[PDB]
Amino acid sequence: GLLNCPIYWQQLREKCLLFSHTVNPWNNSLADCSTKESSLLLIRDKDELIHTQNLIRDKAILFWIGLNFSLSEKNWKWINGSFLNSNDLEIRGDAKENSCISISQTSVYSEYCSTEIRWICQKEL
Amino acid sequence: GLLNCPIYWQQLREKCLLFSHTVNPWNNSLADCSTKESSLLLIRDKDELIHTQNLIRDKAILFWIGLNFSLSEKNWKWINGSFLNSNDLEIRGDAKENSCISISQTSVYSEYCSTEIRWICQKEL
Ligand SMILES: *[C@@H]1O[C@H](CO)[C@@H](O[C@@H]2O[C@H](CO)[C@@H](O[C@@H]3O[C@H](CO[C@H]4O[C@H](CO[C@H]5O[C@H](CO)[C@@H](O)[C@H](O)[C@@H]5O)[C@@H](O)[C@H](O[C@H]5O[C@H](CO)[C@@H](O)[C@H](O)[C@@H]5O)[C@@H]4O)[C@@H](O)[C@H](O[C@H]4O[C@H](CO)[C@@H](O)[C@H](O)[C@@H]4O)[C@@H]3O)[C@H](O)[C@H]2NC(C)=O)[C@H](O)[C@H]1NC(C)=O
Ligand SMILES: *[C@@H]1O[C@H](CO)[C@@H](O[C@@H]2O[C@H](CO)[C@@H](O[C@@H]3O[C@H](CO[C@H]4O[C@H](CO)[C@@H](O)[C@H](O)[C@@H]4O)[C@@H](O)[C@H](O[C@H]4O[C@H](CO)[C@@H](O)[C@H](O)[C@@H]4O)[C@@H]3O)[C@H](O)[C@H]2NC(C)=O)[C@H](O)[C@H]1NC(C)=O
Ligand SMILES: *[C@@H]1O[C@H](CO)[C@@H](O)[C@H](O)[C@H]1NC(C)=O
Ligand SMILES: *[C@@H]1O[C@H](CO)[C@@H](O)[C@H](O)[C@H]1NC(C)=O
């Protein structure tokens, strides 16, 4: 309609973002984004990370993004099928089985996938 | 925007559907639909099931849908958070840990989630 994104979603450059108000493990967070016809957040580079983090007020809160550890392939894999291609995100913590990536306003963390935290969905413009 | 659905997608009543041409285990199929800003297929009732199956040519091919076995409740659960609420799907096979639901032209089957088969994504009009 008037603006680019659905009501309640925040535009950032060429995406619309939804920050959740409730918590979930990573697999449920993926299911929620898919239910909302959307992707878990994908982050291209440090520039995108910083601008996304700049939307967040509370520095302590963690949010799932669409990146987790593929044990068979021994590397971080985006839900879009691509492996993580740099160290731009500077993930803090262990690259191991049943780990998933979260972000805060300040940092990027490996967290166990069962951890219940908020999540960010995106829709591309 | 001549027609309702994106190119390659098939309209069916008030949805756009995408039948995959490659295979994946169920979790990766969910990740694909989410990447495509879409849900794994949800099926309301027998009528939707039959109308969707009517789109399938090959009688031998299975497609994941957005329904799997949630161990805590021992119940089939849709990815939108709701539990299965009829027997309209007449699910064949066992309701047990690590099972997910697939459809063929003729039937609805419980399959192990790791099984590599096609999948169906949807967008609501
Ligand atoms: C799933 O989602 C994920 C997340 O969104 C997505 O992953 C991102 O995918 C994109 C696209 O593939 C990645 O971006 C690409 O990055 C390539 C690598 O870029 C880095 O390295 C470049 C080369 O550096 C070396 O060589 C040069 C000499 O040539 C030298 O100077 C260097 O010192 C070094 O030795 C480098 O140029 C590049 O630097 C530029 O960009 C950075 C951004 O951080 C910035 O400092 C400046 O802008 C600088 O100029 C960077 O360090 C890159 O080659 C590639 O670029 C080509 O493609 C794009 C478009 O795709 C064109 O714009 C460009 O002209 C080139 O043709 C592209 O930018 C990105 O890194 C991923 N991010 C992560 C975190 O994984 C997946 O793709 C998604 N998958 C699907 C299927 O959708
Ligand atoms: C997640 O996605 C799924 C799939 O699309 C949705 O699941 C459907 O949800 C709808 C709406 O809640 C369900 O519809 C309900 O089905 C009940 C069971 O009906 C069958 O079984 C009885 C057996 O006696 C038959 O009589 C009946 O004909 C069906 O074969 C109904 O009882 C419900 O009835 C409604 O109307 C009646 C009369 O008007 C009243 O009792 C109530 O007012 C009631 O509203 C209702 O029709 C449907 O069964 C679900 N399908 C499946 C396969 O699970 C989820 O809704 C969706 N979730 C979210 C959050 O979006
Ligand atoms: C799905 O599960 C397999 C094995 O458990 C794993 O290798 C794959 O990366 C998972 N996919 C996603 C998107 O989490
Ligand atoms: C996520 O995993 C949990 C624990 O295994 C399970 O209860 C839940 O139903 C899963 N979600 C989906 C969408 O499969």
Q: How many structural domains are present in chain A?
A: 1
B25, burial (CB in 10 Å: exposed 0-12, middle 13-18, buried 19+)? middle
**Which residue has the least CA distance to atom 26 on ligand 2?**
B86
Q: What is the DSSP letter of B80?
A: T
Within 8 A of A124 by CB-CB distance, chain B residues are 37
Chain A residues in contact with B77 by the CB 8 A cut-off are none
Please state, in angstroms and rounded to a whole number, the distance separating the CA atoms of residues B61 and A10: 41
Q: Angle A125-A42-A31 (CA atoms, 0-180°, nearest 5)? A: 95
Give the integer Cα–Cα distance in Å for B101 and B111.
Answer: 6
CA A83 to chain CA centroid, Å, is: 15
Q: Which residues does a chain break follow in chain B (C to N more than 2.5 Å)?
A: none
HSE-CB for B34 with a 13 A CA cutoff:
32
The rounded distance, in Å, linking the Cα atoms of B25 and A100 is 19
Residues sharing a CB contact under 8 Å with residue B71, sequence separation 6 or more, in sequence order:
B97
Q: Are A117 and A62 in contact (CB under 8 A)?
A: yes
Q: What are the two backbone dihedrals, phi and then psi, of residue B49, each rounded to the nearest 5 degrees? A: -60, -50
Distance in angstroms (rounded) separating the CA atoms of residues A112 and A25: 9
A50 C-alpha to center of ligand 4: Å? 31
Nearest-angstrom CA–CA distance, B24 and B15: 23
| Contacts of B100 by beta carbon, 8 Å cutoff, 6+ apart | B26, B64, B67, B68, B69, B110, B111, B112, B113, B115
The answer to whether residues A98 and A68 touch, using CB atoms and an 8 Å cutoff, is: no
Q: What are the residues facing A101 on neighbouring strands?
A: A110
- With both helix axes pointing from N to C terminus, report the angle between A26-35 and B26-35 in degrees, rounded to the nearest 10: 50
In the beta sheet, which residues pair with residue A15? Answer: A12, A124
Q: Rounded CA gap, B88 and A112, in Å?
A: 37
> Rounded distance, CA B27 to CA B22, Å?
14
Report yes or no: B31 at the A interface, CB cutoff 8 Å: yes
Distance CA A100, CA A106 (A): 17
A116 closest CA partner among A96, A102, A106: A102
Q: What is the resolution of this structure in A?
A: 1.8
Q: What is the CATH number of the domain that holds B34?
A: 3.10.100.10
Tell me the shortest Cα–Cα distance from B72 to chain A, in angstroms.
14
Q: Strand, helix or coil at B39?
A: strand
- Collapse the DSSP code of A89 into the 3-class scheme (helix H, G, I; strand E, B; otherwise coil) and give the result: coil
Range of the structural domain that residue B17 is part of: 1-125
Closest by CA position to B65, among listed B98, B7, B109: B109
CA–CA distance from B23 to each of A1, A58, B118 (Å)? 37, 41, 4
B84, two tokens: 């299965």
Closest CA to A44 of A6, A71, A64, A14: A14
Angle at A40 between CA B101 and CA A61, to 5 degrees: 125
- H or E stretch including A70? strand A63-70
Residue B31: helix, strand or coil by DSSP? helix
Q: Is the separation of the CB atoms in B24 and B32 below 8 Å?
A: yes
CA distance A101 to B16: 31
